[PDB]
Amino acid sequence: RLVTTFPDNVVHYLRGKRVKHEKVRNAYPLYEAMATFKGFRTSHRNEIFILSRAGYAGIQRYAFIWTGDNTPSWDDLKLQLQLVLGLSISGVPFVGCDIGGFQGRNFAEIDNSMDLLVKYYALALFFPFYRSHKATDGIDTEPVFLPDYYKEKVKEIVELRYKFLPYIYSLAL
Amino acid sequence: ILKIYENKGVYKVVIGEPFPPIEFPLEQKISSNKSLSELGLTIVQQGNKVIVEKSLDLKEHIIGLGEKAFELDRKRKRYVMYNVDAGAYKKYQDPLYVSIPLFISVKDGVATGYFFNSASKVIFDVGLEEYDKVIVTIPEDSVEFYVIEGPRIEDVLEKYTELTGKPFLPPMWAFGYMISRYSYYPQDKVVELVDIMQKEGFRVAGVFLDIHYMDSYKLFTWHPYRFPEPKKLIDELHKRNVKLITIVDHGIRVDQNYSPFLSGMGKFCEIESGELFVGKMWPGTTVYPDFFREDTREWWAGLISEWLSQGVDGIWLDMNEPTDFSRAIEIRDVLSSLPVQFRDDRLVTTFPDNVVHYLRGKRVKHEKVRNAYPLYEAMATFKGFRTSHRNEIFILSRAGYAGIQRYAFIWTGDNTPSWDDLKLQLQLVLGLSISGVPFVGCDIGGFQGRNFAEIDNSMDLLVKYYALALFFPFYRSHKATDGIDTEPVFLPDYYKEKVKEIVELRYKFLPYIYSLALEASEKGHPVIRPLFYEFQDDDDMYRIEDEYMVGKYLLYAPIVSKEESRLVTLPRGKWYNYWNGEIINGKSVVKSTHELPIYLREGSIIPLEGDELIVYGETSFKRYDNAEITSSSNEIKFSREIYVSKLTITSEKPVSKIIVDDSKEIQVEKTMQNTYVAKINQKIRGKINLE
């Protein structure tokens, strides 16, 4: 995976000084989020919403963070919980994961069963960021495409979330 | 150029000047009034390619495409139709062994079929490239496809079957319990095993002989040491009423003293430059028959016929994708030393690109007609049975193309034993079934042995396989060389008894299954069906994949997990619980009450072993022996005199007595809720009344 990072000969200008990318790499997303947040101010937009995949200390000033490209599976339920809680205990409060898992059907070790999907909705019941996201070749995971049995379960879980939204938002404040 | 022909709700669209892999007759070529736009299609011709587009709505369902390791509703995936030796395939792997370029669209409850008659590497991009479109790409400058009107899915399949060919009617023993392995030998061991199986109560219909029976893998030969007395072997099995099916590959060994090689000369596949296509297969250096040629077909039929004359009862065609290993071996020889791990590109096992065939006198590239290869091999093999005046025909094929149903059964190849595979096998056989190939099955217990860690050989999983395929048309146990022995006789009594009861239950339902087979060969209706086939108007049905219908009357929800019970989704209408007698209202979810969750639909007639008969509601049914049975008000009519042993009537209203032909009255007995039994044990002229 390290092959997907910027090469070693890349440089930036931090506070007027020329520095190597490897010395300041992790702060890159922080400064991008900062500039994007500034973009909302420039528009006199009071309701700000920014989602970021990467981050560094301070990223909480400007954005929500979701756990990226997770794989649908029973084990992933426990993994996502460790990921969001680790982020949360580290200063980044607004977090979540892709409900139903991002990965589609590009490899065998993916579990697209509907009862697992229902467990994802239930797992993130109280997560700050509650989003369903799926890859291009993954089955359609919108609740409206589920058999009535499962559709009703997702419907009741989402309604229960909205019922607790006031509490969640107070904690956000 | 663009021509459109119509007739019987089937539009034949011709783009350019097509040269089909096989020609399908049209009994009325009437030029159509409907245009492409009224057909909802867009067509583009480019660099030797034809792209056909159709819109795709959010609620629209796409089914078919044959053997696909994916969910039955095919949306959000780009499929490739190219026969390939899939090896130890896993879910979501594509492509596989069979290529049926047919897909059915169900929009607003109405079904429409689309069949592209090209055996080239056709791409079906179902809402992937463009979320709201189905894009079909045919790698040829010309092509002929058909739009098949429904409106019922069954209506599309009847027309499709009418077009490509009705399934042949196989003998009843072809649906019996088959034992197989890779491989059973020497000949004395084959008989010993059959004896133990029968002695312990297992009714074995036939045994399959894999490649170890041949002499150095040479087709049409017997291993001199393992099978020195083929006649003895054959008579012993027949003496025990057991059929013998022998595997036959497609590779002819390049051997100077091998008869088939010498007699087949002139009829083998060639390469662009004119030499023979010499490759690698089980017998080593090999050449392959060009089955696209009439004469090659006649030559093959002759060898088959001669082979059948020793008393062999069936032919099992394998590796007929067609597969070749020369490329793989070439790579393994050059990089064998290197301590690096190779990638598993299955496409490397297909024929090279420079291979050519002669189709209807014309020289064509293998890549243009590849998928039809197994079809022509099966055709020639079927012709071999005719040449032998053999009425009971049995042919098993691994690969296939549209029309393969005319000549053979298809099994899902080299599956891996695992709990997840239970669900995969169900999608595979149902996909094949909804695509025109009715006689299908999978290797019970899984083919893979112990050549890699991710294989589950637990006995309770094995039992679940037997239970899963309870109603599959093809019921065979097959295992790889290094796999544990999976024959029931080697299981602890606890598990052995369970397999025994499952097999007995299958034989009890054989009459119904065989009647559905007759229906398949006459009307092209599949034997096993996904729920959406009978209830295409209910969107929920397209997400149910661990349940399947056997015919129009029986719903089976096999247990595909370690649980003791499962949730069963019942379609609209009333359903009768086969085991405890409960009748539940459709469009609901209930918990299973038995290990084998079977439910009968209101309006069912099911013939069982030993002339037994189950009737629930009003319907009409044709038994395999031509006897038609009809149930209405309180009357069961028979098209002709037939014997009836035990009659079971399920009814919410009590039944005190039945009357045979207006005179004799038979004692009725309430055995459980909604269940009434009458021990008739006598011939019935024409009717039975209920009171």
UniProtKB/Swiss-Prot annotation, chain B:
The active site is at 318, 321, 414 (proton donor). SUPFAM superfamilies: (Trans)glycosidases, Galactose mutarotase-like, Glycosyl hydrolase domain. It is found in: Cytoplasm. The keyword Cytoplasm applies. It is an enzyme of class 3 (hydrolase). It catalyses: Hydrolysis of terminal, non-reducing (1->4)-linked alpha-D-glucose residues with release of alpha-D-glucose. GO terms for biological process: carbohydrate metabolic process. Transmembrane segments: none annotated. Belongs to the glycosyl hydrolase 31 family. Major soluble alpha-glucosidase. Pfam families: Gal_mutarotas_2 (PF13802), Glyco_hydro_31_2nd (PF01055), Glyco_hydro_31_3rd (PF21365). GO terms for cellular component: cytoplasm. The gene is malA. This is Alpha-glucosidase. One of its GO terms (molecular function) is carbohydrate binding. It comes from Saccharolobus solfataricus (strain ATCC 35092 / DSM 1617 / JCM 11322 / P2) (Sulfolobus solfataricus). Its EC number is 3.2.1.20.
